[PDB]
Design a protein around this nucleic acid. Structure first.
Lengths: 117, 98, 155
RNA sequence: AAAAGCCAGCUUGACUGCGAGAGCUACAACUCGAGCAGGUAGGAAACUAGGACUUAGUGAUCCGGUGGUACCGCAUGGAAG
RNA sequence: UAGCGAAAUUCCUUGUCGGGUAAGUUCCGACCCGCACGAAAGGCGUAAUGAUUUGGGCACUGUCUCAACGAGAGACUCGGUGAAAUUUUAGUACCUGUGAAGAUGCAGGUUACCCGCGACAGGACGGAAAGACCCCAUGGAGCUUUACUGUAGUUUGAUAU
RNA sequence: AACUGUUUAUCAAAAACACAGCUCUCUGCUAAACCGCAAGGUGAUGUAUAGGGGGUGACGCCUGCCCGGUGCUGGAAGGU
RNA sequence: UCAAUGGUAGGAGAGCGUUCUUAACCGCAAUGAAGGUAUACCGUGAGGAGUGCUGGAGCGUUAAGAAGUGAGAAUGCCGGUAUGAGUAGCGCAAGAUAAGUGAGAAUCUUAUCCACCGUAAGACUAAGGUUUCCAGGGGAAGGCUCGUCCGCCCUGGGUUA
RNA sequence: GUUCGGCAGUCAGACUGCGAGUGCUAAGAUCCGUAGUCGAAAGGGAAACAGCCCAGACCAACAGCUAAGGUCCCAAAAUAU
RNA sequence: UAGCGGAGAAAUUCCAAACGAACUGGGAGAUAGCUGGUUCUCUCCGAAAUAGCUUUAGGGCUAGCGUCGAAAUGUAAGUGU
RNA sequence: CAAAGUUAAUAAGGGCGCACGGUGGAUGCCUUGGCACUAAGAGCCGAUGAAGGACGUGACUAACGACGAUAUUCUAGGGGGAGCAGUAAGUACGCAUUGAUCCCUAGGUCUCCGAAUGGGGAAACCCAGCUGUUACUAGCAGUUAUUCAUGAGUGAAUACAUAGCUCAUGUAAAGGUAACGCAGAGAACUGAAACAUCUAAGUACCUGCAGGAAGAGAAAGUAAAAACGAUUUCGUAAGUAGCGGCGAGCGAACGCGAAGAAGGGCAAACCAAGAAGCUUGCUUCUUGGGGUUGUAGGACUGCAACGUGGACUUAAGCAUUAUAGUCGAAUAACCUGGGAAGGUUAAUCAAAGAGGGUAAUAAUCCCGUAGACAAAAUAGCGCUUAUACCUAGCAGUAUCCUGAGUAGGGCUGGACACGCGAAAUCCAGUUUGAAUCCGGGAGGACCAUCUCCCAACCCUAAAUACUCCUUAGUGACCGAUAGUGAACCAGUACCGUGAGGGAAAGGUGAAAAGAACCCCGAGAGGGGAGUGAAAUAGCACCUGAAACCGUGUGCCUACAAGAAGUUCGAGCCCGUUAAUGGGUGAGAGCGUGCCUUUUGUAGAAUGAACCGGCGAGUUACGUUAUGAUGCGAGGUUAAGUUGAAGAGACGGAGCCGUAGGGAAACCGAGUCUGAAUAGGGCGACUUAGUAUCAUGAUGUAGACCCGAAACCUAGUGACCUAUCC
């Protein structure tokens, strides 16, 4: 019963290497540095499944205080006027109005002006 | 292993020598007499032809415990306890010991 | 074992400074001189059940063949020649197709029995043939109608 | 201090067989002990008494003694043990 | 006891003094306080003898002031020929910190066209050496003894001969 | 340190070893001593100027004291 | 619906995959089995098949049993390939030209000079070596490079008392 | 929670306070009790940080709200009152 | 002249590129409280680093600390306030 | 004019991803090899020249093989029937259905060495002597080792004798040995947590003695009551009784169950013969009867012929097996392909549909297979036959016999479970030493009663142990790192002086059909042609990764200081297990490799060159726990027998539970403790297990592996070197 399963073992080897392909140079020409190299990459892809959340929101709030600051408005009193404001506490679609919305942007800003007012 | 200390059993006194002439009788209950009725001349032939125990210590003995369902007198024994002699011998038995 | 088949019971160098590690030998198994670790052994594998679960086991597949009815009560049909055109057309005279067990008597029929081993589905059997690898193997069988004193007598 | 302190008389309970109940806790240990019996000992009786005001003052099993021993006593008795 | 004594012996301490020496803990000679000299474990002497050990001097002198020169071999340029040790892979800088308490790879900050080539050694706690120092193992060897057990051997006595 | 010799080849040549010398002790012979179970043999075809062991290491001077203890030797009274 | 789901040594449960399993169940296979290869599918995972291609004989199913049974890692081993690196070295002495040789000459052969050793780096002879000798032919490796040359290789002779 | 039964490993930890001891009331020093933390628990904060503070992660997600801590730029929020 | 040995101008020197105990084969896969190594997938639960003893202190044996199963739930013990 | 600002690809190279290369041979398959194991045999050979070498022998010039100057074979027999001319090419004379080659059996010769032996001698040697031969300063053929035994002769000191010597006869017998045995000699390491007792084990080793088995054995026995009746093996008792620094461990027997089941001689006593201490009556020897004993038996008085390995395991027939082999059934087409046995269509067979070949999987193609025949010689086995020869019962008891340094006793040992102990009992050394049938011994010190037996004399099959071997074979063996070190010219190469060690490697294609030719090339090698199903198929050749080296390829990079990443993404390129496509990737955010150990390692703590292959928690037996199943106070067959290494069935011997208390006497659902019937202690109250399986853990086994320095035994070694001659 001295049996091997050799091609099965190399199929685990082949399976992880074909799933490991792409990174720098020697790595797919070797075995084991590639093993972390997918692995570390979706460790912090697991973090960036939370951190492109927490950085695209920085793009969101940052560009919306960029246009608010273009109206001379600061993000904290704007959002403060958003809690003062209507049923809208809508956040990041309200970040998405950075394209071409003087009506939506500056008028909802005026809604916030009559919310602080 | 007590950690190099002598063990629990290693601290024990040497108690009681043992009789080489120790011999018993493969004692049965009277509950098997509740099984078999009457089996006149209750003996080893009734015991091992009853197949209760086959390899026996030579004689036989019943308890006072177990019940007086049997009727026969002539129970052939080596030694039955006198507590059971009260039972069967007060319950229509005769002593045939050995 | 390494100590079963060998050539070497002597350390092949000495370690200190000289390259490699603490090490037994090439005869130590990790070289091409491979000693098996714990491996097989010359072992047996037998056991037989107690009687009441054995006859209980015969009287399980027995019952399955009872209500199944793929056993068929057959008379002697003890023939002149041993040729298997006989039993080819008597066995194929109902032609149970896949594979069949053949209940002889216990007097030992001899003509499908010194033959019919080339009949590829024929299993020569008696009351002295009983197992589960007997009957669950074929599932489909002919009977000699002495099956009372060929079955009941212990069962 | 109702003395555990001190002094006199009795005095040999610093009894036997225990022991519910406990405490302490690896175990082994260890700390007590209600109460009962068998008789006791003081004390008129009641009452007290299983060492000391409590706490050091002590060690595991073996092995060989000392005595008793309704025990066994290697077929059988005894004896040896 | 003789006799030698800062001994191949005094760490007692650069003992003291004198000589060599301008410069003199070392050297010699005496002193001798001899921790702890020392007599057959010879002691004190002792020419010749020493690949001795020191201390001094003469001689000669690139050792050095302080170096420089040329000759040959590698080196190095090419043709042929062509290995070793070596290792997680790495397109591998600096500072200051931090941290199994000393950074290439970390945080902050600095400078850096890309790739070489000839020489050099500060790192990469460089290799090569499962520390030979120390410690531990109920580890083993070897050695010693008035350890304990023995053994042979040596020597009594009995007793068959 | 006398010397010459010898000395760790894979470190060390020396004051280390050795050496004549000197000292003591043991052995009367089938030696002592030694090797081997013994046998056999060395010692040596040796006979105390010889053989064995111990010290020290030419030559010159000198080797002092202490037998309490140890060991050794010898003796036997008694103890064991 | 509510509640739970960090988790090492720890403990419990469950499942995957390999191979053999006479079992059967039940097929595939030259129109292509296995195996390999690319693959931009699926499966919580392990894992599974689809297609393209190599490839030309056994393999797959299911379910269950049985196991030398699930691979990184130990100075693990064996086998191959790096690396350093076209770098070290090219193993203590000087040849030179012309001509031949060949296909190809530095290194083969000759001529002619030079040079070296010469109490040897001569000749002869122990042990040793065990045919290495010579002749002819050849150049797979060997010659530390080349190489027509050779103690290399093939063939043949060669030692006489 | 007890009981019973298997099956374990753990023996040597630190650190932060807080209260002790020893020490120059030296120490990232020892040695206790006491809680936490790590170990064996990510993320955020403090420039990186195992131990301090906050906050315990099944997973997706281009959701929001918030803990401490921040809001002149890196680096997001207040040149806030 | 051969390893419990030998040799020895003696250092612990040598006994075939080599010795405080040679080399070869077997015992014997000697042993090793010490080092290293350990291979498929998931889920759930989830530590200790301490006491006591110990020729014991880098190790064991209990007990405290996990896990699963079973028997009831001391009729609630547990755990809070 | 200019002034600013801006972005560019051209990449020396490099990276990504892709394509195709070589390279390496894992893969995947095969298996002529090996392992284990069953059944049946054989289980020894040899001086009447062994084992084992060395050397030769072939028309080829090798080497292996095989044989032995006759030499790559010869005789004789018998089978056998077409080619032969081992290996294999490779050649030649040839040779051959007349019957070869070949197979078997028997005989022949048998180089040298070697037990090796005429004598010496290092292995393949030298030198002889004698007897005939035949010729020569030849050659041939034989004899000539030793010890033992048996004779014969000889005959010293010293007369006989004796020692001693000489000759002759007898392989005897020395020697080689697979494993098992027996007997002697006999450790250590271990473990005991160290270790001096123990253990390991009387095992490792070593020496001797033997056969197919060995020992083994016929009560001077066990036991304890009626109790049987040599042994041996297995199961049981059962780790039970015991012993033991009573630690750690070691360890029975009895009885029962199964197999197997055979006992028989002698000395003694006596009787007869002889010869002789013939010192007469001899009281020693030789021959033959006598009879081999336990409830004594024989001798003395009585008195019976039973086959017999046992009261002759001789010879003659019978029968059959190894030893040569022989016959031996049952089919065609189509499709596919290079090829059918594959698919398809049909048919047959039947004691043969085991298995293997065949270009691709066969029952009908072949070998075969099942069955059925065959051996002269061949080695046997077995049956029948008279013979191959020694035994019986029996009553009584004149006295004798019956196993002398023997039992015993002392001491020192050892074995027996037994470690000196209460120590049995046996066997050793040493010492002392009986009785003898009215006897003597055993009954775990020992003294009486009882039970049993008769030593101190010898042989004994059978059941058992193990295989180098001979086949018949079998595999949930194994597939070329495996499986024997060794599938291959393996114990090879090679190392070492030696003892020793000890490798690597199989596959073309069906068939070499092995690439004619032509061209390049010094040659090789290539390239065309052609070969074959295929030439990436071309001689280490199936299949071909992997590291390594490449060559091409779309994108990007020569203001960049990263565990080399994600995530987003400008921009570019391409279009897919048709998919919210892929290949990129500037740029930008955030990001300390993996393993053991640790309190904490990112590490300047280890370790890993890489790649692939191998490579580690088992089982044997036992216990416990948990379940599963079965039956249940009843569960249970072990060993064994049967049988296909089947199954089933038999086999109840034994084992578990079915009350315990107390050391024990004992008592008993109670029991012990204690004056207690006081209390306490354990107890039914306190309610089912048994058996099997399976899983975890356990314990003896190297027991999860890798690991020392070590210990002892056996053997080798003085050419290095030291000494010495």
């Amino acid at each position: 019963a001295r049996v091997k399963g050799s091609v099965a073992t190399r199929k685990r080897r082949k399976r992880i290497l074909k799933l490991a392909k792409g990174y720098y140079g020697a790595k797919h020409r070797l075995f084991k540095t590639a093993k972390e190299q997918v692995m570390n990459s979706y460790y912090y892809a697991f973090r960036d499944r939370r951190q492109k959340k927490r950085d695209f929101r920085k793009l969101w709030i940052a560009r919306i205080n960029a246009a608010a600051r273009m109206n001379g408005l600061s993000y904290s009193k704007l959002m403060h006027g958003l809690k003062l404001a209507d049923i809208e506490v809508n956040r990041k679609m309200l970040a998405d109005i950075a394209i071409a919305d003087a009506a939506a942007f500056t008028a909802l800003a005026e809604e916030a002006k009559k919310a602080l007012a | 292993f007590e950690g190099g200390q002598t063990e629990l059993f290693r601290r024990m006194p040497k108690r009681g020598f043992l009789n080489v002439n120790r011999k018993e009788y493969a004692i049965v209950n009277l509950e098997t007499l509740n099984r078999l009725e009457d089996g006149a001349t209750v003996s080893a032939e009734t015991l091992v032809a009853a197949k209760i125990v086959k390899d026996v210590k030579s004689g036989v003995k019943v308890l006072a415990n177990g019940e007086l369902t049997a009727k026969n007198l002539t129970v052939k024994v080596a030694k039955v306890s006198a507590a059971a002699k009260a039972a069967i011998e007060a319950a229509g038995g005769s002593v045939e010991e050995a | 074992n390494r100590s079963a088949v060998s050539g070497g019971g002597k350390k092949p160098w000495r370690q200190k400074g000289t390259g490699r590690a603490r090490q037994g030998s090439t005869r130590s198994p990790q070289w091409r001189g491979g000693g098996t670790v714990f491996g097989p052994n010359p072992r047996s594998y037998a056991y037989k059940l107690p009687q009441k679960v054995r006859q209980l086991a015969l009287k399980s597949v027995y019952s399955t063949k009872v209500t199944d009815g793929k056993l068929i009560a057959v008379d002697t049909l003890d023939f002149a020649a041993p040729k298997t055109a006989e039993f080819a057309k008597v066995i194929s005279a109902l032609s149970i197709e896949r594979k069949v067990l053949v209940v002889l008597p216990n007097e030992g029929n001899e003509f499908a029995e010194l033959s019919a081993r080339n009949l590829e589905n024929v299993k020569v059997t008696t009351a002295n043939s009983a197992s589960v690898l007997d009957i669950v193997s074929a599932d489909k069988l002919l009977v000699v109608q002495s099956a009372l004193t060929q079955i009941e007598e212990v069962l």
